[PDB]
Amino acid sequence: KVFGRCELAAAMKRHGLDNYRGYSLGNWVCAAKFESNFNTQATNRNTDGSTDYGILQINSRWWCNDGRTPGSRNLCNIPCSALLSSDITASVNCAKKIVSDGNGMNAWVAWRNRCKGTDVQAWIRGCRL
Ligand SMILES: [Cl-]
Ligand SMILES: [Cl-]
Ligand SMILES: [Cl-]
Ligand SMILES: [Cl-]
Ligand code: NA
């Protein structure tokens, strides 16, 4: 599913991401835009052989099991394919574990490079939440 900006903002808000670990909703919408272009089916393969999955591009090296990343962890205890669902619950629940692990949203390279330090409130402007 390819979300609309305000549609995804509302879905993330109802799943508890607004101000989660101090990150306002615009940060999460901005990260999703640049990680996946709002597409739950996005996948991208990394140089180490791991793959990133879903709207928040969660990495199989640490967070999910895809059966082809040897020696990797599955810290969210989910198959990576569950992160590609039109229902963002599994991606949100895993993202909450990632953002809580000490490095905040810096785990998302596109957030660090394209959202951090910008007016992220602009990503939720006009939306009915
Ligand atoms: Cl915001
Ligand atoms: Cl594996
Ligand atoms: Cl959803
Ligand atoms: Cl933080
Ligand atoms: Na894994």
From Swiss-Prot:
Protein name stated in the entry: Lysozyme C
Task: Quote the PANTHER family the UniProt record gives.
Answer: LYSOZYME C
Its primary localisation, in coarse terms, equals secreted
State the reactions this protein catalyses: Hydrolysis of (1->4)-beta-linkages between N-acetylmuramic acid and N-acetyl-D-glucosamine residues in a peptidoglycan and between N-acetyl-D-glucosamine residues in chitodextrins
Instruction: Give the CC-aspect GO terms.
Output: cytoplasm; endoplasmic reticulum; extracellular space
**Using the chain's own numbering, where are the disulfide bonds?**
C6-C127, C30-C115, C64-C80, C76-C94
| Short name of one Pfam family | Lys
> What does the annotation say about its assembly with partners?
Monomer.
Query: Any idea of its EC number?
Result: 3.2.1.17
Q: Which family does it belong to?
A: Belongs to the glycosyl hydrolase 22 family.
What is the annotated tissue distribution of the protein whose record heads this document?
In the egg white and polymorphonuclear leukocytes.
Keywords from the UniProt entry: Allergen, Antimicrobial, Bacteriolytic enzyme, Disulfide bond, Glycosidase, Hydrolase, Secreted, Signal
Location(s), subcellular: Secreted
Q: Which residues bind substrate?
A: D101
